[PDB]
Amino acid sequence: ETLNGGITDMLTELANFEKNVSQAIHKYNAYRKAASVIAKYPHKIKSGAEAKKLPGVGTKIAEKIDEFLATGKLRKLEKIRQDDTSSSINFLTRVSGIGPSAARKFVDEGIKTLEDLRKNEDKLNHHQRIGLKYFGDFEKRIPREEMLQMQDIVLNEVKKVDSEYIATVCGSFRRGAESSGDMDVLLTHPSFTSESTKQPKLLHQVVEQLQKVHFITDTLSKGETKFMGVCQLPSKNDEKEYPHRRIDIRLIPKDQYYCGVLYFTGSDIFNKNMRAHALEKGFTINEYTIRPLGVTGVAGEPLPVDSEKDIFDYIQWKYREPKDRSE
DNA sequence: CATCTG
DNA sequence: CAGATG
Ligand SMILES: [Mn+2]
Ligand SMILES: [Mn+2]
Ligand code: NA
Ligand code: NA
């Protein structure tokens, strides 16, 4: 957690680069189990050899560790932090819609910067366009104070369309967090479930409304269950408009809301522990359901949940306020 | 994993 | 349809 820090870090820089610049998924994947195992490792790695001793630890990495250990740096790492081509990809990649794949093409075409991008707005697709248009707003975090307003709106509109809608703002916003990154909304309705054959309108009607009133400003992606968009709190008394915010909304069959709801709320760590325990208590949990574990090895059957209460209950656990879902 | 692009 | 982004 701090004993093998640098090493686990450099390994990361390294892994990262492989996958993003080169395509070295293998290699990339290599750095990772490695930093993963060095990470767990209880002592102070005093040398390569010592390391090598580990699983996932090859000669090549051992090598690298030596050099890093020996000297506060790694040549290779130094060559990559300079290299403008590598740099570009880590950059372009910052645009919503631009993955690495695309980061490469553009570079090979000479688009390396934001301007480059604007000038060639033709090569970018819709999402990519949007991402470009909101690059700034995009990277700005979401203050709770805004979150609450947002939430307030969303909830009032969903309600209006159907008193029967059930909406939840999961995410950290749900876990306490003073600021968030995007707004994740879980959606269900009684009339939608496991078996119930669809009802796309269920998601579309609200999406409309949100745009009706102008909260939703653009569409990133719009499926029958998931909507990726952009929204925005009405600029008040003109002088201070709000940044544009990433927003996602997803429909869920009523019969698997809370699992999801729990699930989305995290934290990852809270989950696992919950999952691990769930397992003890003779259960299995996932994004959609909790299931009574048979002994034969495994086994299932959807346990019935009517809240997050029902869940914990199952695992015979302490109902955790979302704040304490931390870890 | 669900949506888009081409 | 494979492949890419989130
Ligand atoms: Mn979030
Ligand atoms: Mn999200
Ligand atoms: Na991106
Ligand atoms: Na293939």
Residue A216 β-bridge partners = A231
A140-167 b/e (C-beta count within 10 Å ≥ 16 → b): eebeeebbeebbebbeebbeeeeeebbb
Cα A21 to ligand 4 centre (Å) = 19
Structural tokens at position A136: 């700034």
Q: What is the DSSP letter of A256?
A: G
Which amino acid is present at A271? N
What amino acid positions of A are annotated as catalytic residues?
64
Q: Which two tokens mark A103?
A: 């980061």
Q: How far apart are the C-alpha atoms of A250 and A259, rounded to whole Å?
A: 14
Contact present, A248 and A228 (Cβ < 8 Å):
yes
Of A16, A7, A27, A5, the C-alpha closest to A80 is A16
Distance A53 CA to C6 C1' (A): 38
Phi, psi of A165 (to 5 degrees): -70, 145
One-character DSSP codes across A187-209: EE-TT--SSS---SHHHHHHHHH
Q: How far apart are CA A232 and CA A240, in angstroms?
A: 12
| 8 A C-beta contact, residue A217 and residue A231 | yes
Q: Cα dihedral sign for A89, A94, A100, A104?
A: negative
Q: Would you tell me which residues have their CB within 7 A of strand B?
A: A 125-127, 221-226
Element (H, E) at A218: strand A216-222
Q: Decide: A215 and A231 in contact? Cβ < 8 Å.
A: yes
CA of A126 to C1' of C4 (A): 14
A100 CA to middle of ligand 3, Å?
A: 8
State the Cα–Cα distance between residues A97 and A126, nearest whole angstrom: 8
Asked if A89 and A103 touch (Cβ cutoff 8 Å), the reply is yes
- Class of CATH domain A84-140: mainly alpha
Which of A96, A115, A93 minimizes the C-alpha distance to A21? Answer: A93
Q: Where do the H-state alpha helices sit in chain A?
A: 5-20, 25-40, 48-52, 59-70, 75-80, 84-92, 100-107, 114-119, 126-133, 135-139, 144-161, 172-175, 201-212, 257-265, 268-280, 308-314
Transcribe A27-72 into DSSP letters: HHHHHHHHHHHHHH--S----HHHHHTSTT--HHHHHHHHHHHHSS
Q: How many CA atoms lie within 13 A of A123 on its CB side?
A: 14
Task: Report helix, strand or coil for A216.
Answer: strand
Roughly what angle, to the nearest 10 degrees, separates helices A5-20 and A100-107? 60
Q: Which residues does residue A246 pair with via DSSP β-bridges, in sequence order?
A: A230
Give the C-alpha separation, A173 to A142, whole Å. 9
CB of A205 within 8 A of CB of A229? no
A1-83 CATH pick, 3.40.50.2300, 3.40.50.1860, 1.10.150.110, 1.20.1630.10: 1.10.150.110
CATH: 3.30.420.40, 3.40.50.920, 3.30.460.10, 3.40.50.720. Which one for A141-263?
3.30.460.10
Identity at A198, one-letter amino acid code: K
Residues in contact with A106: Cβ distance below 8 Å, sequence separation at least 6, in sequence order: A92, A98, A112, A116, A117, A123
Q: Which of A311, A270, A268 is nearest to A289 (CA)?
A: A311
Domain chopping of chain A, boundaries: 1-83, 84-140, 141-263, 264-326
What architecture (CATH level 2) is domain A264-326? Answer: 2-Layer Sandwich (3.30)
Contact in structure between A61 and A69 (CB atoms under 8 Å): no
**Structure tokens, A281:** 């208590």
Q: What angle do CA A80, A93, A246 make, to 5 degrees?
A: 145
Say whether A141-263 and A84-140 share the same fold. Answer: no
Please say whether the beta carbons of A116 and A110 come within 8 A: yes
Nucleotides in C strand less than 7 A from protein CB: 3-6
Secondary structure of residue A151 in the 3-state scheme: helix
Round to whole Å and give the CA distance between A228 and A249.
Answer: 7
Residue appearing with tokens 């250990």: A69
**Strand B bases within 7 angstroms of protein beta carbons:** 2-6
